[PDB]
Please model this.
Amino acid sequence: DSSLYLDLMIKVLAGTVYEDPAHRETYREEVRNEGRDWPANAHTMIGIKRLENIRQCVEDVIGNNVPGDLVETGVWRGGACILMRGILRAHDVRDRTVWVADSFQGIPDVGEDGYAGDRKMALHRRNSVLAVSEEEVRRNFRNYDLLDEQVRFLPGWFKDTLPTAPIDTLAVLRMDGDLYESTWDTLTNLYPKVSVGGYVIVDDYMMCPPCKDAVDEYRAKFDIADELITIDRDGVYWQRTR
Amino acid sequence: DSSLYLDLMIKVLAGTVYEDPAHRETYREEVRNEGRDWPANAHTMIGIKRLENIRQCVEDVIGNNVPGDLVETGVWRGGACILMRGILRAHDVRDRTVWVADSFQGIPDVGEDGYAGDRKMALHRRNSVLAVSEEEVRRNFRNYDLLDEQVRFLPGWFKDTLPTAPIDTLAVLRMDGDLYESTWDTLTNLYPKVSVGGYVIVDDYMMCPPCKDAVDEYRAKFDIADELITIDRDGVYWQRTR
Ligand SMILES: Nc1ncnc2c1ncn2[C@@H]1O[C@H](CSCC[C@H](N)C(=O)O)[C@@H](O)[C@H]1O
Ligand SMILES: Nc1ncnc2c1ncn2[C@@H]1O[C@H](CSCC[C@H](N)C(=O)O)[C@@H](O)[C@H]1O
Model:
């Protein structure tokens, strides 16, 4: 029911239910299951396994009454954040907010002074696909009837928005910002808000050297020993215990 | 919950949630709301208002315990029938079947001996869009996780399949066969199975002269005075009371 709803939402968001093909820049269920393409029209690129991970983490924080809001840093068309809001709706949770943090202009051009690994990737060149306006994201929330007071937006570059984001505590921090600098700025500003029992999800860890660098360096610097658990061929997560 | 699920299902089936454009043979919400286009990819052409009518009728027969199975005669990609099965699932109804009746080859070519109104329309020429195989319909049910024992298929021309269909009683009869002959063959064979309290839905009444002819003639012949109620700019329905 809530369970039928969330099951269907995952299938709709990833576009498996309507066999949404990969972006011009075929549909293969095995590829979509692991989030290994960019859907032409669907609302998230993270795939079924990473959507299921969001569901499991958010349901666990609700079931264990771990305090805090939910956030995604790097949202594209908004589908992962739509799922977060839908899970709250399914469980009639009225006292948590979903924070939708993005430039709404794609990946920054890190320039000559960027982290070497970020410069080498030149991921801003992918902005023809990766830049999605806030108006489009809002419309996507409205399409699911989920644009309401429990959704809040943090538009701008993370280095500008996250230090002053008016978030008190976080139960789930989902990071999907593609660069060393984006990931570092997310962890430095938002990890201290994560409650004990809460989760940090790293979208692109195994196959993204600069993202792997940022996560490992932050964890080493702050002696975070909570183990990284895999999700699929790309993502990992951990639960904060201390 | 069941209600969140069914709300989302209607939006997914019609393709409003992902703004599915009209078939090559733009997306406009007002057009999709009234079922006035053929979606490029979505699973039904009947639109939001006609999907909502199915929901209301099926929920009413469940809530009033009107006996019988559910059937659609003319299914295209299967979306109206997927909704019927989903409503049963949402309410944990295990003792009704959804019957999916179609040629799976599009509209018949009525030939020189067809009803004059059917011959003039030459709707078989639209089969490039209207012919959808049973394999495709089955796959669509599977995409929603709704292909199970409570879905049954009646493949073939209605004149061949309906006289011997092993249906005992019907709580909802949804007719969407586009022709005088299709509509007449549906009513003659299946209306006698409709329980008191059950519903007959006519997809294409107001703007389809041959369909209007068949429904009105059948109702006049059998003295059916239960009033026709409108749905949108096209469909009507009635409830059997006697
Ligand atoms: N430093 C930064 N500041 C703001 N937005 C950033 C950023 N680095 C990356 N982004 C954003 O990160 C996103 C990467 S794609 C995110 C995919 C999304 N989680 C999904 O469910 O499909 C883009 O929307 C991009 O604009
Ligand atoms: N005499 C007949 N026998 C079998 N199938 C028929 C028929 N006349 C029309 N059809 C079928 O009627 C359908 C019309 S389109 C139906 C639309 C569908 N109800 C929806 O939800 O989108 C086609 O699939 C066509 O194959």
Summary: Chain A touches chain B at residues 1-2, 4-5, 7-9, 11-12, 15-20, 41-43, 89-90, 143-145 (CB under 8 Å). The two ends of chain A are 35 Å apart (CA to CA). The pocket of S-adenosyl-L-homocysteine (ligand 2) is lined by residues B 44-46, 72, 74-76, 79-80, 102-103, 106-108, 130, 157-158, 176-179, 182 (CB under 6 Å).
